[PDB]
Design a protein around this ligand. Structure first.
Ligand SMILES: CN[C@@H]1CCN(C2C=C/C(=N\c3ncc(Cl)c(Nc4ccccc4S(=O)(=O)NC(C)C)n3)C(OC)=C2)C1
Length: 260
């Protein structure tokens, strides 16, 4: 059982970014016999108290519950100071950069695959009654060309243009508001890592959305798919599909794309 890893099994590599609690490094988990595996190591800033430590480690506690091919995998924790969380490394990095950089080398079928894969992770999370609250390409990682994984999972310490009307207006976050965000995430993927509502102010966004305005159909996005996206953006959350539906729809759209 035990998620506690001995610190000498970890070789800290280069800083690859920042979480809310501190720096994230790439690195290696070493074990006897045993090829050696690339890991992400999340660190914590100024946690000179239990409370900050407890908040930071909650991410690990949350990820203990999940076992999915398209969700970042927790490997372990080191709970004596400095406290670290060890995760699997998604070696190709952040989705947006990957999409931007590989625009002329990715076919439409790959973009749909990523959407389908993310929807299986989200249908999984739905069944655990886990509300993610920030589904956006910034939180998707690339493990390989044919594999993406969803991250955080962790706590703080507002993503207006990704959020459902009911999340913005009534601080409501549910499975249906996550579906809305997934729709925007799919727009980002089809758009190759372009941000929704560029040059638009956050306080403008709810005005436009309640006036019925929606993100336009991406060039070379199939109609059946933009049709699925628009259903994610139904104002009335009770009419949006659930991730179980989306997973089955994205499957047929993907398969019809690989069939020409
Ligand atoms: C932009 N500068 C960096 C240079 C290379 N970068 C990355 C980013 C992610 C990355 N892969 C990760 N794989 C797993 C995990 Cl948990 C991970 N975590 C993060 C890396 C960087 C910043 C934040 C995280 S995070 O706190 O776990 N949250 C992410 C979902 C954004 N990265 C890379 O693998 C080599 C390289 C970006």
């Amino acid at each position: 059982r035990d998620y506690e890893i001995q610190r000498e099994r970890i070789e800290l590599g280069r800083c690859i970014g920042e979480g809310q609690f501190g720096d994230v490094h790439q690195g290696i988990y070493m074990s006897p016999e045993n090829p050696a595996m690339a890991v992400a190591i999340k660190t914590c800033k100024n946690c000179t108290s239990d409370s900050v430590r407890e908040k930071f480690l909650q991410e690990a506690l949350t990820m203990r519950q999940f076992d999915h091919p398209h969700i970042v995998k927790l490997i372990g924790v080191i709970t004596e100071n400095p406290v670290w969380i060890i995760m699997e490394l998604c070696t190709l990095g952040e989705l947006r950069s990957f999409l931007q950089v590989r625009k002329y080398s990715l076919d439409l079928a790959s973009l749909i695959l990523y959407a389908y894969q993310l929807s299986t992770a989200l249908a999984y999370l739905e069944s655990k009654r886990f509300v993610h609250r920030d589904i956006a390409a910034r939180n998707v990682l690339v493990s390989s060309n044919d594999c993406v994984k969803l991250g955080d999972f962790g706590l703080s310490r507002l993503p207006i243009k990704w959020m459902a009307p009911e999340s913005i207006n009534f601080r409501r976050f549910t499975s249906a508001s996550d579906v809305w965000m997934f729709g925007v995430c799919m727009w980002e993927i089809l758009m190759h890592g372009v941000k929704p509502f560029q040059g638009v102010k956050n306080n403008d966004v709810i005005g436009r959305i309640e006036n019925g305005e929606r993100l336009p159909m991406p060039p070379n996005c199939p109609p059946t798919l933009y049709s699925l996206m628009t259903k994610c953006w139904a104002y009335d959350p009770s009419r949006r599909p659930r991730f179980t539906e989306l997973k089955a729809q994205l499957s047929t759209i993907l398969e019809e794309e690989k069939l020409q």
